């Protein structure tokens, strides 16, 4: 039985794909709505890989899922590689 | 800055010592009471070491903290620690 | 008193750090050279975290440690640490 | 292809039953006999439940399989 806690973004996994896995598992998770809100607002960010997590934290609290997906969409892409270093 | 999510029982760490570290961080975590309750239900078990995690899950639901402490207490048995300042 | 069998990559532990812990324990393990060879061939992969393990297995046989680190790292990338005392 | 590394004695599992499961997986494990031998000397003890592991460690090196089974047998 796979726990939501076991869903962690892979080292080079696109954020969008991690989000799909996370929400698939979340839909199966036995937890109150309040806990699921904590899972989508906090756990999703905490279990992101170091590349995406840094980006997400800088967005600050209250970012929508859409905003998080926009923010990490470019990770591993040429724009991302080019901007550092 | 340490997240409750990152408090994980070391391979040779006495369960009671891990529980103390877990609750120390939990008290500092900024989450609702309902979320913290879920953390003691689920996250505390998830973050136990392999030797102990299997044992805890086999207890079934609703084990008291001392029953968990007892199930995973090692050289043992029950030990008592002074308060720290 | 850790065994090599106790060395497992944490869910957020950089693979490089895990490899360092693994080889530190390996150098102290009392096993034949053949068994230690097996430990770096198989045990190192088996005790990687689930997301990294899947990636490492998919590499096929004979990957170098460098190849394994690259595979379980993000965009940037290699990190660098001072030698310990 | 379950790994021998994942065969662990349950908290209420009779040691003899765990031994049976261990050796069934071991026969399927692809490793040299010397590695398999290290697995029976070390991994079998490492993956026993905590009380049994404590008992087996106290037995010291070189115990026969039947010594181990007597040591961890239930009542």
From Swiss-Prot, chains A, B, C:
Name of this protein: Capsid protein p24
Region (Dimerization/Multimerization of capsid protein p24): 1-85
Residues of the full protein shown: 279 to 363 of 1435
Post-translational modification: Phosphorylated possibly by host MAPK1; this phosphorylation is necessary for Pin1-mediated virion uncoating.
Cellular location(s): Virion
Function noted in UniProt: Forms the conical core that encapsulates the genomic RNA-nucleocapsid complex in the virion. Most core are conical, with only 7% tubular. The core is constituted by capsid protein hexamer subunits. The core is disassembled soon after virion entry. Host restriction factors such as TRIM5-alpha or TRIMCyp bind retroviral capsids and cause premature capsid disassembly, leading to blocks in reverse transcription. Capsid restriction by TRIM5 is one of the factors which restricts HIV-1 to the human species. Host PIN1 apparently facilitates the virion uncoating.
Summary of subunit composition and partner proteins: Homodimer; the homodimer further multimerizes as homohexamers or homopentamers. Interacts with human PPIA/CYPA; This interaction stabilizes the capsid. Interacts with human NUP153. Interacts with host PDZD8; this interaction stabilizes the capsid. Interacts with monkey TRIM5; this interaction destabilizes the capsid.
Ranges that cross the membrane: none
Organism per entry: Human immunodeficiency virus type 1 group M subtype B (isolate NY5)
Swiss-Prot record, chain D:
Record region (Dimerization/Multimerization of capsid protein p24): 1-75
Protein modification: Phosphorylated possibly by host MAPK1; this phosphorylation is necessary for Pin1-mediated virion uncoating.
Protein origin, superkingdom: Viruses
Location of the protein in the cell: Virion
Subunit-level organization: Homodimer; the homodimer further multimerizes as homohexamers or homopentamers. Interacts with human PPIA/CYPA; This interaction stabilizes the capsid. Interacts with human NUP153. Interacts with host PDZD8; this interaction stabilizes the capsid. Interacts with monkey TRIM5; this interaction destabilizes the capsid.
Function statement: Forms the conical core that encapsulates the genomic RNA-nucleocapsid complex in the virion. Most core are conical, with only 7% tubular. The core is constituted by capsid protein hexamer subunits. The core is disassembled soon after virion entry. Host restriction factors such as TRIM5-alpha or TRIMCyp bind retroviral capsids and cause premature capsid disassembly, leading to blocks in reverse transcription. Capsid restriction by TRIM5 is one of the factors which restricts HIV-1 to the human species. Host PIN1 apparently facilitates the virion uncoating.
Protein name: Capsid protein p24
Naturally occurring in which organism (per UniProt): Human immunodeficiency virus type 1 group M subtype B (isolate NY5) (HIV-1)
